[PDB]
């Protein structure tokens, strides 16, 4: 996904590479529905 080519090895952990949201616990839909 995205303009990323590497597909073999990620060195740093995911948490330290990208932000993560904390839990609170082709086919394209149309942006308008007409009942």
């Amino acid at each position: 996904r995205g303009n990323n080519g590497n597909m073999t090895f990620n060195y740093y952990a995911n948490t330290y590479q990208n932000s993560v949201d904390f839990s609170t616990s082709g086919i394209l839909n149309p942006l308008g529905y007409l009942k």
């Binding site: 996904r1 995205g2 303009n3 932000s19 149309p30 942006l31 308008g32 529905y33 007409l34």
Partner: protein, 255 residues
């Protein structure tokens, strides 16, 4: 064919009237399009502890250090502060002080939505030959620490040390790193219509819509100040960008 566009929701090739269903052959994806570097702003380089600009309005005869620092945001900015009306000094020589301004032309050329969110990846490039420098950054809502301390009768600005990241690059080098989305607001409003304060506010001026602040300085004591100025360039990138609702596009003149 039969249709009713006044209702808004119109139906949906040549197979319908006369067909051709040319096979597919995803370069427009939001995540993919916005992943590439672009210039943001050009700033001076510090050589001593500086005094941050005062909030507007700034009266005549106020002592400060202007031209340094720079926000990290596509929205228009003036004097390193958030702004609404973009402007430039196309006029010839005048008086007073000229206010640095910035804007993301490429971002706004396709900013066709309202809300946005992504990670930012910063890098720095020097301009003058064989120049040595360093960078410092702090989150949104923080402040820049002033003053200096004495070591062996050398005045070292306080910004040499801090809990926020610092970067030292070799002679004629370059810097790069990726920062996290850290503002309090859930998403970045490309265009806004609210107010940030109960009274004396300005309509449509967001408060904390940015990624942080950046500045550049030389690793030397204050006792070795020079005369010739130096400059630095900045670039930014977006990672895992997302958009949340349609919008308009900039108007093109018919001249």
């Amino acid at each position: 064919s039969t249709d009713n566009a006044e209702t808004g929701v119109i139906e949906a090739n040549t197979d319908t009237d006369f067909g051709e269903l040319a096979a597919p052959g995803n370069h427009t994806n939001v995540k993919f399009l916005f992943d590439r570097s672009r210039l943001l702003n050009v700033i001076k380089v510090l050589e001593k502890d500086a005094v941050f600009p005062r909030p507007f309005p700034t009266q005549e005869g106020a002592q400060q250090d202007d031209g340094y620092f720079c926000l990290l945001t596509p929205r228009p900015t003036v004097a390193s502060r958030p702004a609404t009306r973009f402007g430039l000094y196309a006029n010839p020589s005048g008086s007073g002080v000229l206010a640095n301004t910035s804007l993301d032309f490429n971002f706004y050329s396709l900013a066709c939505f309202t809300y946005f969110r992504s990670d930012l990846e910063v890098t720095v490039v020097s301009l003058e030959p064989d120049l040595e420098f360093a960078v410092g950054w702090f989150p949104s809502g923080s402040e820049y620490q002033a003053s200096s301390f004495v070591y062996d009768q050398l005045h070292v600005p306080f910004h040499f040390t801090g809990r926020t990241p610092r970067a030292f690059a070799s002679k004629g080098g370059k810097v790069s790193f990726v920062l996290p989305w850290n503002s309090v607001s859930s998403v970045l409003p490309v265009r806004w219509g609210g107010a940030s304060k109960l009274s004396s506010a300005t309509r449509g001026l967001p408060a904390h819509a940015d990624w942080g602040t950046i500045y550049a300085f030389v690793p030397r004591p204050n006792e070795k100040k020079s005369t010739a100025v130096k400059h630095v360039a900045v670039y930014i990138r977006y990672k895992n960008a997302r958009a949340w609702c349609p919008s308009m596009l900039p108007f093109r003149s018919y001249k």
